[PDB]
Amino acid sequence: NLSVEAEVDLLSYCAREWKGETPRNKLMRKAYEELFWRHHIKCVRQVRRDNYDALRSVLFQIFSQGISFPSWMKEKDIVKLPEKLLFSQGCNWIQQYSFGPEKYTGSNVFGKLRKYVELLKTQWTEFNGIRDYHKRGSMCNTLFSDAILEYKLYEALKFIMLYQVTEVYEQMKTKKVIPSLFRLLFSRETSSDPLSFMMNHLNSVGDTCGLEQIDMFILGYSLEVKIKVFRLFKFNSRDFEVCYPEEPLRDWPEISLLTENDRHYHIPVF
């Protein structure tokens, strides 16, 4: 039931899961050994459930570590963002949101977005007002054992990503300075504008694909969290340690994730 599986000793998992003599398996065991001895990661919580796994892993880290709302949410109310885009964007524009695996075609994308975004606001607020990490831990095991609620929070996060994509696109069109990552996003045909991004990429997250690397950048930027990732299959190479985004002069909160294939992001436990 629990989608962020119970912790297992890193060296045990490494020895049991990656037994063998192939060049790839040998490299994987060296990577995990590096994680243990150099970075003092003692255990691992596996996150391999569905195509929301990237969002599942990041959200788990935010709540478990007690990270609060990003700065731009201080002034803007989260629950009003669906209305703002309903207003700024077209009535048909917003009705094209499909809610990933729901493959929704009903008549109120607006009501659903507002409800789900409200649930994320409520849940996130509850975690912010708890200083004891243990209490947050048990709450996470409860939350991530309720897949129906999980999906609603993930679609809320996907909407927040879409909102930031729409904000930054408007900045680019009005000749404002924007992050090079967003300018890169809009250079791709299938994501040249927020509508294309939603229909061709975001609508698929959780249904047939997970978050791509560029999507991890958008998520971190949107939540103002530095997502540090150990890419184990790239051990002994430049991109073994990566951060989404690469905003050195940010002073944002930071979370760490482990991945063997850029598809599933396991939780490092110290």
DSSP labels, 200-214? HTGGGBTTTB---HH
> How far apart are the C-alpha atoms of 46 and 25, rounded to whole Å?
18
Could you tell me the CA-to-CA distances from 211 to 170, 215, 241 in Å, in that order?
A: 23, 5, 18
**Burial level of 65, CB count in 10 A (0-12/13-18/19+)?**
middle
Distance between start and end Cα atoms, the chain = 24
> How far apart are the C-alpha atoms of 57 and 164, rounded to whole Å?
20
Q: Which of 209, 213, 96 is nearest to 159 (CA)?
A: 96
Retrieve residue 69's tokens.
Answer: 């709302």
Contacts of 136 (CB under 8 A, 6+ apart): 63, 64, 65, 66, 127, 130
> How far apart are the C-alpha atoms of 184 and 29, rounded to whole Å?
35
> How far apart are the C-alpha atoms of 93 and 150, rounded to whole Å?
25
Please say whether the beta carbons of 265 and 58 come within 8 A: yes
> How far apart are the C-alpha atoms of 221 and 215, rounded to whole Å?
10
Q: How far is CA 264 from the centre of its chain?
A: 11
Could you tell me the CA-to-CA distances from 62 to 82, 123, 140 in Å, in that order?
A: 23, 12, 10
CB atoms within 10 A of CB 106: 10
> How far apart are the C-alpha atoms of 140 and 59, rounded to whole Å?
10
Sign of CA dihedral 102, 6, 220, 32: negative
> How far apart are the C-alpha atoms of 22 and 222, rounded to whole Å?
40
Q: What are phi and psi of 41, to 5 degrees?
A: -85, 115
Residue with tokens 């690469």: 246
Q: Which of 17, 11, 54, 12 is nearest to 35 (CA)?
A: 11
Q: Which of 59, 40, 39, 41 is nearest to 49 (CA)?
A: 59
DSSP state of 264: -
CA dihedral 147, 152, 158, 164 (to 10 degrees): -140
> How far apart are the C-alpha atoms of 60 and 68, rounded to whole Å?
13
3-state secondary structure of 44: strand
The amino acid at 53: D
Sign of CA dihedral 197, 203, 205, 207: negative
Q: What are phi and psi of 234, to 5 degrees?
A: -110, 20
Q: Which of 109, 129, 106 is nearest to 117 (CA)?
A: 109
Retrieve residue 262's tokens.
Answer: 């850029």
CA dihedral 10, 223, 97, 94 (to 10 degrees): 180
Please say whether the beta carbons of 235 and 34 come within 8 A: yes
Please say whether the beta carbons of 58 and 257 come within 8 A: yes
Q: Which of 247, 210, 257 is nearest to 101 (CA)?
A: 210
Sheet strands side by side (includes 265-269)? 8-9, 43-45, 265-269, 254-259, 226-231, 241-244
Q: Which of 192, 267, 183 is nearest to 217 (CA)?
A: 183
CB atoms within 10 A of CB 21: 6
Please say whether the beta carbons of 57 and 265 come within 8 A: yes
Please say whether the beta carbons of 260 and 232 come within 8 A: yes
Q: Which of 265, 270, 231, 220 is nearest to 56 (CA)?
A: 265
> How far apart are the C-alpha atoms of 216 and 210, rounded to whole Å?
10
